[PDB]
Amino acid sequence: MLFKQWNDLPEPKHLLDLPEISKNLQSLEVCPVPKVEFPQDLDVPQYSTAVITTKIMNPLFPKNLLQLTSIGEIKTTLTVKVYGFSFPIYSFGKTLLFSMEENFISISPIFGNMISRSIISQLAQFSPDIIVIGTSDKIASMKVMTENECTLQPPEFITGFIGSVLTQLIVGPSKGLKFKCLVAPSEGPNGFEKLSLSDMGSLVDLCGQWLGFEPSRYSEECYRLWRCDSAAIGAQSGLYI
Amino acid sequence: SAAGYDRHITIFSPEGRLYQVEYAFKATNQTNINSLAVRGKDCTVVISQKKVPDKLLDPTTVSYIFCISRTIGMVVNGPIPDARNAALRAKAEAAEFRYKYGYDMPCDVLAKRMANLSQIYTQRAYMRPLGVILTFVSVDEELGPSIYKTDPAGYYVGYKATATGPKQQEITTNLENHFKKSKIDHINEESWEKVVEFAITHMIDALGTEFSKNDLEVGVATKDKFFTLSAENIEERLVAI
Amino acid sequence: MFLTRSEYDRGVSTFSPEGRLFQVEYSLEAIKLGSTAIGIATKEGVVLGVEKRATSPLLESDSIEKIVEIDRHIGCAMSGLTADARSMIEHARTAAVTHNLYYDEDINVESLTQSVCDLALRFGEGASGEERLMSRPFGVALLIAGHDADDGYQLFHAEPSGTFYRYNAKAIGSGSEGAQAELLNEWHSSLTLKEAELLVLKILKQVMEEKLDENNAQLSCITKQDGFKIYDNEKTAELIKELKEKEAA
Amino acid sequence: MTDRYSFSLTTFSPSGKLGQIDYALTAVKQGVTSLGIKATNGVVIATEKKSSSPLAMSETLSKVSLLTPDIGAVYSGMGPDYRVLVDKSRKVAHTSYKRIYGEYPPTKLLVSEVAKIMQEATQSGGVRPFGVSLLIAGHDEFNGFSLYQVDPSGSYFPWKATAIGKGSVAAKTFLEKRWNDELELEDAIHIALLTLKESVEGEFNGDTIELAIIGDENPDLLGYTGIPTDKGPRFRKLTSQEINDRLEAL
Amino acid sequence: TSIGTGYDLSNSVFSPDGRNFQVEYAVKAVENGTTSIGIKCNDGVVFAVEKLITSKLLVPQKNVKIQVVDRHIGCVYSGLIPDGRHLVNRGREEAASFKKLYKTPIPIPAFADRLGQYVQAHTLYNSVRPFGVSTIFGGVDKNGAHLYMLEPSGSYWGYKGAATGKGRQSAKAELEKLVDHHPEGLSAREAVKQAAKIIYLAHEDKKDFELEISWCSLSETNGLHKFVKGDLLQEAIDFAQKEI
Amino acid sequence: MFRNNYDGDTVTFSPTGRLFQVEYALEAIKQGSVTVGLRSNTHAVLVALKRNADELSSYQKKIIKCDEHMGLSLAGLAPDARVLSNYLRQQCNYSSLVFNRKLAVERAGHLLCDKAQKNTQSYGGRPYGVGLLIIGYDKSGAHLLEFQPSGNVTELYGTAIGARSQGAKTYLERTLDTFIKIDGNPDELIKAGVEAISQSLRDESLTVDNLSIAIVGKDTPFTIYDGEAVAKYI
Amino acid sequence: SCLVLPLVSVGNIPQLSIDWLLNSQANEWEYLEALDSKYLVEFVGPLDRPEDGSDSLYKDADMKYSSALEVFYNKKRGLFAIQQRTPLVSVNYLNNFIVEIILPFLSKYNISEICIWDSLYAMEDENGVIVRPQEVYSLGEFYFDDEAENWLHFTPTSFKISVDQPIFKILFQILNASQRPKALRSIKYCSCLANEGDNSLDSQQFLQWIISQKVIKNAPPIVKFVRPISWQGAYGMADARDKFVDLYN
Amino acid sequence: SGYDRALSIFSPDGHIFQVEYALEAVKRGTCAVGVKGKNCVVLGCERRSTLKLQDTRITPSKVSKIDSHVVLSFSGLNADSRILIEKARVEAQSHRLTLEDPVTVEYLTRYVAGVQQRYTQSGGVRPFGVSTLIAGFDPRDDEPKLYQTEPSGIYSSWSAQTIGRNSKTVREFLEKNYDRKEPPATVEECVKLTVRSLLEVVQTGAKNIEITVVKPDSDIVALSEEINQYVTQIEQEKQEQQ
């Protein structure tokens, strides 16, 4: 190229381009807070294990093999002088599952914060098994953490809905809970992240170990779910080799 | 400091200033080398201070004085890469002028040509000015001894005698005092050796220091040719005075 | 250690810190917005099936044509942006006609697919050192079917990334995942032409929000004897009726 | 691709103003004052020759340049831009008029060409607008004497008398109070000297003032004798001695 | 002042102090390269490179760190390998053109000037980046032996002794000590021994290393650039080990 | 965090003196499968593990023939790999047709370095993100070259690139003297390469559909075995 | 009695200065408490320690993680310092953050001083609040005793304030609050002009200027500048350069 | 958002925002309706209220006759529409010269879409903010042809389509009143349907409705006052229904 455009100067990266809630940038007034409502008929004590993750980890939970069933949903509403989304909750065996759908284009992090607070408040009454599955873009390799040991490097950190859940578990209103967290490296914006084959395999192996299933069938089903045009893989087959 | 798009290209600031040109002027004086040019009755002398802080460097390879053509010599203040680039451009321009117009290029016309190139650099967005100050010295057949100087801004002008560098103000003041004392506007010596000795004494008085044979670089322009004095000639001049 | 915005997914000629090109991934995401297109290649020929997703009732049935004829021995189906697909189809037809003119023979399907992938690679450096002709990569995925003496019946999937694969049965579109799973679980080499057509219709009805009918379902076939042809509405309706009869019992 | 074009360097502000042109005007207003006043039988152009460290030769650098034997110009702003514009104006005057009609162009047409060049500069994505303002004084057979002012935007206006640069408002007021319809060339020169005397901060001698006149023909400056129809230059530059003699006198 | 924010994202931008920060960043990249030194004896030039012992899978025959431009020109560099290799290729093209035109080997100062012009031309536009290599080259011509070092800015100078890389500073001191020990002159074999000694002194980082020494002298190699043979190389290694 | 401000293009250097886009291009290699290359004295062998999108997809053509005496295997980005393979084919044909001379392996490596270095210093182009393993035989014997897309070429007896290639490289380095003296029996060299590439497998085994072999030699023209042809080698 | 509240601004100079402030002298600073972060993008991270080999600010041994919005306390000089890692969600939630998070913290510990650190980009100066670009830093002061019911007074520095700037809304909410503390007396505002990039040295010089101006009453001088260990990972792996042998040599 | 400042940038969800912004600019202009009859095509357009001091003698017609058998209407920016119409007429004449056969409706629509696509392939150009309706008959039969072309270069075939501001109401009216099984057999029925559809959004149908009728054999008759008669008859029938 003879030259590059003079006006092609990037904007400062200090502020993220998060979606706007209210069109009034000079409101000078308190902004309304989203309201979250947890079902009152979920019967939490009937289940002794709850898993909190996002939609990207759907291949880790095959439907037919685990016998997923629907019980109730979390309703989130917000009024601005209009946002409303449905959060289904699944159940396999005796274990509940929350899989929030992140979308940095249309869904603000405040909804995720409210949902995480509601879920942690509801699940802290009985203290079941807590398993956190998520991804961070600042970690070099896969990380396994518990409530007593932090394996993250000083530069590495976890942000997002999983980060909100971990914050509520550690320094939130409800403390003392025991949790196991599995974090895998990823790239991309929230709700559109991508993984690698090795990371997917490691996640599948660790999930199978922590869920108690035969490695052969579990791995076969997980691989079939990954390769069936899953959004997490992306274009690994079409871009590399 | 600059603010906006006027940091990488040459456009007007809100105060009507070109910051890149001023920063190139700042870059010119980063070599910490001072030069002097004085015209005699039938000769012109340029003397540049030579610094060799490193004894692992060959002194004979350090030179900011260039022979543009048979009669024109050039002295550059600033970094040596842009100095050599300007030297090659000046050589090409002088040769092309001689080829196209049938007679040797005078010093003022070459200075104007370089100034026009500098103006191109200062107006074009994708081109940058050369952070060097050029001084052409010759003995023109129509104007006698001639010293002309051009800067990154595209401004050129002739001088009775000139000084340049970080400590140019003291040398300029001493030259003005000498001219007021004599009121002939040039040097009365009829031999170029005497003019070189006078320039050496003036530089010693202005800078308040004594030089060796390796601390000076002298070029003399006569009617027929411009030649750079060697170490032995400078030593002979020092021994004489 | 602070949260700052990352801009590695803006420029096409920019690598992610792990070495990925997010523009191609976004192009695939755009392709996912297109309607479902299915292609099944068996020893009796290749079958293509698309859904005519009509945004308005007054839209013409023949307006939407996502199954084209690259050549008498090469048919194509598209999913994604129609604008880029038009240029890709025109280039493929031009290449086929030029090959016929200069060689007096039909072009192999693999050669045509490679040519289309070379065209799709134009957003960067060309295959033969050619310069850049596209500001952004394509947003269309192609299913190319054909028949030739070298490899019998061939079916290929071509991506904007410039890499193509050979598939026995490939479905890409809005309902790509479910159709792909059904093809993986319900395919065998003993499928006949009728069985493949019925399977395509059943999968389309499975992955369609509205009721299946010939208005929003186009079926085309390519065989050695009759080249490439597209079934009309009457034959598709008869096939749908037969599928309903066989699924009832 | 992203190499065959460049975005426009001059763009409109939300208020409806071109920022680069305004900044060029600001740069012009920071330059040395240059003035021009028209008489009934001539035009006077004057400027102050500001200098660097007093070792340079002021005669080598001239801020008043002959465009055509009957048309001259002065500037306020940036020197190299003025020099480039002067060279281009001389070349355009020769190519467009002298080589076509056999005659030098009138003042208005040359001013229009210069304004067109400057406007093309302001409409480009590769160069910034020029940073000079030009006072052009000329004479032609069918329009007599004329004085024009050209701005960095390419807008030119006629003037009976005007001034640009640092001391422009005060000079404009003084010239308005001094100019009259019956003024002559000597009175115009005297008024121009008086106006310059109020703006120079240093020595007000002939070595720091550049003055030119569009007066009558000068057969002694033609360079040859023998053709009565041919006339000498109508543009003359006053020497230092003449300026000093006028300064000592009224 | 080593980090100029706001004036370091483009190649050809002057900072308010009047500095080009891309050039200084290229210099910083050079400072992280391998140590290479060059010495000038009475009638020749010696180059020494301290290389890291890589995997044994590499062929120890075709892998040579010191680059050859022309029969009388030797060259080493520190920085980025692709940039140095491209610069060596350009130098080879220039030498070939000069010899093809004027029927004589290109003089060292002319070669240095052409290389400096080519390197400096890459600091004039924002569509290119400066080379991230410092190059120590030299040779023998009709005027004698010449040794030059060229910086990423395009500035080149002639040196009695030049050093670059991680262990440059101490090496330079050793080079200065050499000038303080042999002011009158130096022979080629003594130059090889001292180059080996300086490389051994300045490689104390640890990971085993290897030494590569080449020389070009009129009275030892008939004015040609040749690598030091096994006997003299082993002698130099033994001398360097004994000196420590 | 401070790296994010200096990784926009290949023209920008970090304050510490880094070129991050080229580093990312190099890191893009490990996203591809594993390929191994090795030669003793007269034959050069490439072994490649092929990958498929799913069950119904075909397998990627890891090894592509460049000329009767030269071939390569690719690991990394498919577009850059195809561009460089076509470039090498064109260069071999150009050398043969113009100079009446077969292209040398070292000359091909120099050409690849020249082409790759240009995109690392000029704006408007993306650096290549594919590594190559080239095997050839010429008048100087058998040669194996590893080409790093930063613009680097190394000559070695054996190596391996791609995902999980560290185990194969360690095995090759440990047993270097075992296979470096295999002269005149290409089958042993091919089996040694297969054993080397089997060390990089993780929860997978070599089959008849995901293994490809390429062999060149003195009297053996460059040939490629795939499918049933490699069934004898398991 | 003095509170330091950094803002997420251009170049993160305030926040980094906070990292300069705490880790330069970790003896006098200890972790105090984590505030509610419902209005942030709060993260979870490990502990951070000074590079010179000092004890971590988190004295308690039962905590191994960290949150975004945290408050550290200096009991020797009674200074509260806030640290934020993730930016505030949107711009219309500043009012809620002021009147629902830091509002209880005011009058929770009876703080008698507020200090706000900010960095402004000179390019986005739409309202032209900058009048003397010769200087780089700027200071403004406000007293409740000397003022009843733009509204600030600035020292002879580089620069009123723009209505769009966060500082104006912060001041409006602090003054107009119906739950404001009775012990709040003085508000001080330090601002710096700088560009985006590696602002470590810029942050250090900004902190030096703040200490020299004695904006904080109980701010001791710093004689040795020590970075947190996390800054060693700003460019990535510590030995990343050694890895690319083919690229660096 | 960060992914909307260029036409060559893909969004993470798979959208090009500049195309959407061009569509929004299109939806800002006056309405335009195209209806296909059994053997005729009707193009209706909405004219903004004419000012008192505006010359009505040479006021431009919203429907431009590209060729003796092909007409064009637009919605969006007027000057860009003029540029597109000029290019389309030049291309039609060039095709007639080159192949001795007048252009078909589909070919001309494809050419217009191709021009609009080409004006999206560079970062230094602004795409046309015009959506066009092309109507006519192929010059060898009596089959009506109506096409809609969008700024992105996408062209589609319709039987009754509305583009412009408040086009949802007219589209719903056409959906609830137009049936492809029984298209209006006569020209009068199609004209009445178009006028009634336009009246759903036009404040005053006496001076803000323009009707053009295209029939086979390349006739093309533009209705004058007659539109006022249709409006009055529709009002009378509506009041009779009341």
Residue numbers in the entry:
A (entry chain 7): 1 to 81, 117 to 276
B (entry chain O): 8 to 248
C (entry chain S): 1 to 249
D (entry chain P): 1 to 250
E (entry chain U): 2 to 206, 208, 210 to 247
F (entry chain T): 1 to 234
G (entry chain 8): 2 to 150, 166 to 175, 178 to 267
H (entry chain R): 2 to 224, 226 to 244
Q: What do the authors of the reporting publication say about this deposited model?
A:
The multicatalytic properties of this proteolytic machine are provided by the subunits β1, β2, and β5. All active CP subunits are initially synthesized in a precursor form with N-terminal propeptides (β1pro, β2pro, and β5pro) that are autocatalytically processed upon CP formation.
Remnants of a tryptophan- or tyrosine-containing octapeptide stemming from β2pro can be seen in proximity to the β2 active site. The late-PC1 was resolved to 2.7 Å, whereas the late-PC2 was resolved to 2.3 Å without applying symmetry during 3D reconstruction. The most striking difference between the late-PC1 and late-PC2 is seen in map densities around the β2 active sites. We conclude that late-PC1 is an earlier assembly state than late-PC2 and that the octapeptide represents β2pro remnants. Our late-PC1 and late-PC2 structures suggest that during β7-driven dimerization of two 15S half-proteasome precursor complexes, the maturation process initiates with autocatalytic activation of the β2-subunits. An unidentified density was observed in the complex with remnants of β2pro in just one half of the late-PC1 and both halves of the late-PC2. We speculate that this density might be remnants of β6′pro or β7′pro, which were cut by the active β2-subunit, as it was already suggested in previous studies.
